[PDB]
Amino acid sequence: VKTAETGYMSRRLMKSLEDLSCQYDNTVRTSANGIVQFTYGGDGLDPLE
Amino acid sequence: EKAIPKDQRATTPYMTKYERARILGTRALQISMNAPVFVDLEGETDPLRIAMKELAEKKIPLVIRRYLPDGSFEDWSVEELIV
Amino acid sequence: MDQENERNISRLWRAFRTVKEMVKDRGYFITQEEVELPLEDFKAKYCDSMGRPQRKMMSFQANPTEESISKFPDMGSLWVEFCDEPSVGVKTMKTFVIHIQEKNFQTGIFVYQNNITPSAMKLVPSIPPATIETFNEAALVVNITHHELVPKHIRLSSDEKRELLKRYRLKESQLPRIQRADPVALYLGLKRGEVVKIIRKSETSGRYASYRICM
């Protein structure tokens, strides 16, 4: 069952959040330049770091 | 479309990982198109390794143009962007 | 029956307190004395000897404060009128609308008991100088801004909105949106295009602020 349903939520959320990227003024925006977060996580910090 | 003067620049003074990867790729492409290089090759023949050496010496002659979401941009030469 | 009477007394007292707080933070001269009102005191004032809660003289007029008027100059008195029917009618709506218009109030708060007529959708917008906000007496039994899940929404003046949109170099279409009839957009009496600053709290990022614009 898991191998059948692997990468389902991944694909769905990919369609939801695919175009969001951090901007050079520390904002997260859609491809339509609409603000989703004025700063990432309210912190600006990368979870990878 | 307006260039923000070098005096007042709001973006990071640090080269991002994406800017480094793109700079290396562009410079290696230029070198593979027989662009002159500004480092001592010391037997290196691969454009990506030549470009990595140039980046290590901060001798890559390219400028990063950082467009803000409003449309304005600011120019950061590769030398001044700190790594 | 006395249990139902007591329950309605308590519920109306709590709703009156909710409206007092909602006027207080929408910005008007309402002090903690008239906010904090015990159930016995509320009965001592707004009831008859049979115990049936009256909804006629509970209505009060409040006016903007000096700080509030300094922020927003074009804000005037607020008049909040309670209703006393399961479903209210077309006549009382006209009476209250004309009352607000002639008393020259910038807006009026209509609180009904159970429900309102469908034809009321057509009559409540028709008032150029003012606006009428209609609630349900149940919908203000306990105010949503005191809930642990609701973070502090703060209405921004026109100057504050201009600075925000200039500091971030945005246009109003790019701001995050808060709906009309959002339970907090109604509590704050936000109008279309108003920008509210939300002081939300996280666990791994402390206290930070977001913004929404009313659509």
Added chain:
Amino acid sequence: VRYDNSGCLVKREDLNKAEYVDQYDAERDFYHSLREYINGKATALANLRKSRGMLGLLEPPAKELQGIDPDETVPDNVKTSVSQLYRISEKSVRKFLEIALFKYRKARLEPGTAIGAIGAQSIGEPGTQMTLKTFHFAGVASMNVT
């Protein structure tokens, strides 16, 4: 520097007034927590100093006798025991602050990051290891919650 929603400064009496919160507050709290951590280290040293009989110099000294070393009488034994237990050089404090600030700077999310796609995979990867049907630990006997 903290500004109001209009752009002017703040009165030093309402910096934490709960409505002048803005960006840079995470960085302000990081600097505060750095100061608090170093304060805890200094308080540990000060309490050792007090216990070993010398003065706990946690506060700067305001008197005539500040210029001379406040440990001159200490008989070279409790002094060396304190230096044995807690010994925080200026090089250590400066290196600690440099490391912490440098790491805080490194932590900032780099512009251009496909942070939405990364979040999509970060929320959908751990989900690829949880059962589609509800399985519960034996003995929990809770409500059959999805």
Added chain:
Amino acid sequence: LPDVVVKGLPDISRAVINIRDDGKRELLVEGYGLRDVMCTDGVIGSRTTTNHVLEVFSVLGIEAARYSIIREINYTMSNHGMSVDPRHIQLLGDVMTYKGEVLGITRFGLSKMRDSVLQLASFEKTTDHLFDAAFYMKKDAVEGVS
């Protein structure tokens, strides 16, 4: 006649009084009415949280709804021992609730503001979206990575 509601709320499945591994007693109810439970006497309406995001949004608003989304996803990912940085969850809640309404990640929720005929086609429901965009003569910009 026997199956009529003479007391209580006509939406609650049942009610259980519980213990949070401590000494205070609360009731976790299984219904679909949050306004009513907050308004019922003997319950703190200020501290009353359902599992239902769409019930929080209708009652408390969009910010409390996004708090609920964040908290429920964190709860689901912490009972399984998954380790996902909360900033990913905060980004998910923000993308769900930044348009002012809780929008799903479904073929209906995605039709929020995109006008992205090609993105919608590449996700799902291709021909309906394509003919719709041709009929209304949609002039979408090419901005999506898809």
